[model samples]
Target: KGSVDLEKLAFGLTKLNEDDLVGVVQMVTDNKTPEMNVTNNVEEGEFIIDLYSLPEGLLKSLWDYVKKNTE
Candidate 1:
């Protein structure tokens, strides 16, 4: 079983302005799962939010958000 830290996730989401949060949510919720190619290290790639672009304080919060909310 796994656990989630909702408070931390909420804090991170709250850090983003409404527009940014919308983009992040869209990127995360999109159907973009990819399977790695056996012949090549890289197969299909998916969108990855550049959380580094966010304030340093929000990194942990973003991570916690994904851990809890990602399907």
Candidate 2:
């Protein structure tokens, strides 16, 4: 999978509500969303998400929405 900007994603997640956060996390963990990747970084005590499927561009819009409202 391609690399996603983990920092930016974490920032956006902070601005997300519990409902949306849980929803997205569930889908990613269940492998329902294509191009979305998750990693278990136990050493860092973090669950990492990588939006590598930029080809579909869904995450692009969603993430941009988060950034727009956050900033």
Candidate 3:
């Protein structure tokens, strides 16, 4: 089913000064179906998203939004 949210999540997480919504969107869309695993435990050598660089406010809003739909 076609949907919307993850892109908004990434879009929110990214700083606008970069002026590259396309890349952010592409990255998020491309990773929407990762070859590895979104929930794969790091104990077994896995990883999660690295969005530690975004503004706190943005992160908070993004999390509040996507967390409801995060895979």
Poorly placed runs, candidate 1 (over 4 Å): 1-4, 31-71
Q: How far is candidate 2 from the true structure (C-alpha RMSD, Å)?
A: 6.1
What would the per-residue lDDT of candidate 3 be over residues 1-71, giving only the tens digit for each residue? Answer: 13334455655544333334334434444544423223435495332454444444444544564444433
**Clashing residue pairs, candidate 1?**
none
Question: What TM-score fits each model?
Answer: 0.29, 0.41, 0.29
Candidate 2 per-residue C-alpha lDDT over 1-71 given as tens digits, one digit per residue, 9 for 90 to 100: 15335467557765677665655455456653556666757796445766654334545544655565556
Candidate 3 regions with alpha-carbon error over 4 angstroms: 1-50
lDDT top scorer: 2
**How high is the lDDT of residue 4 in model 2?**
38
Q: Supply the global lDDT for candidate 2.
A: 0.56
Poorest stretch of ten by lDDT in candidate 3: 31-40
> Distance (Å) between predicted and true CA of 64, model 1?
7.8
- Every candidate's lDDT: 0.44, 0.56, 0.44
Clashes of each: 0, 0, 0
Better candidate by TM-score, 1 or 2? 2
TM-score of 3: 0.29
Residues 10-39, candidate 1: write the lDDT tens digits: 455546655656655554444222331112
